[PDB]
Amino acid sequence: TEFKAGSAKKGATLFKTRCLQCHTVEKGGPHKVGPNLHGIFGRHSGQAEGYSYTDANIKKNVLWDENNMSEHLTNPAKYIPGTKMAFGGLKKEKDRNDLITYLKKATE
Ligand code: HEC
């Protein structure tokens, strides 16, 4: 029950405002700026095995899931330091839930 009924529409724009530019998430799509995500939920990082990953994610390596994803957005700094990714944490948790829903839909 950690995930509540949220709407991806609100998170969809947040992704477009600060995520689509770096992550294409397109299926079989090429890699741009950051690695493409696809099924990363319930899986470990490095799945792309095609795009290099910051030493932190490689050495630290974290499991990605609906719960883990919320922690990444809440504090992406200490969570994965040493990477070229710099996303500001969102003070509102409700908005964060919608952002996860947008990528979660892509996993379908
Ligand atoms: C461009 C400036 C970025 C934006 C904005 C976002 N991400 Fe990113 N991300 C970026 C890079 C440089 C990397 C690769 C190096 C690394 O290991 O981090 C990443 C990586 C991720 C990952 C982890 C990699 C993996 O496990 O496969 C995740 C899951 C991730 N990024 C998520 C994410 C989200 C939630 C963002 C928008 C909502 C987002 N990133 C923006 C660069 C950039």
UniProtKB/Swiss-Prot annotation:
What the entry says about post-translational processing?
Answer: Methylation may enhance its transport into mitochondria. Methylation occurs in fungi, plants, and some protozoa, but not in animals. The precise role of methylation at Lys-78 is unknown, but it seems to preclude pro-apoptotic activity, possibly by lowering affinity for APAF1.
Binding note for cofactor: Binds 1 heme c group covalently per subunit.
Q: Which cofactor does it need?
A: heme c
Q: Which residues in this protein are found as N6,N6,N6-trimethyllysine?
A: A77, K78
Write out the entry's keywords from A to Z. Electron transport, Heme, Iron, Metal-binding, Methylation, Mitochondrion, Respiratory chain, Transport
The terms under GO molecular function for this entry are: cardiolipin binding; electron transfer activity; heme binding; metal ion binding
Indicate where this protein is primarily found: mitochondrion
Q: Which GO terms describe its biological process?
A: mitochondrial electron transport, cytochrome c to oxygen; mitochondrial electron transport, ubiquinol to cytochrome c
The record's misc note reads: Present with 7330 molecules/cell in log phase SD medium.
The record, for PANTHER family, names: CYTOCHROME C
User: What protein name does the entry list?
Assistant: Cytochrome c isoform 1
Give the organism, scientific name.
Saccharomyces cerevisiae (strain ATCC 204508 / S288c) (Baker's yeast)
Q: Which gene encodes it?
A: CYC1
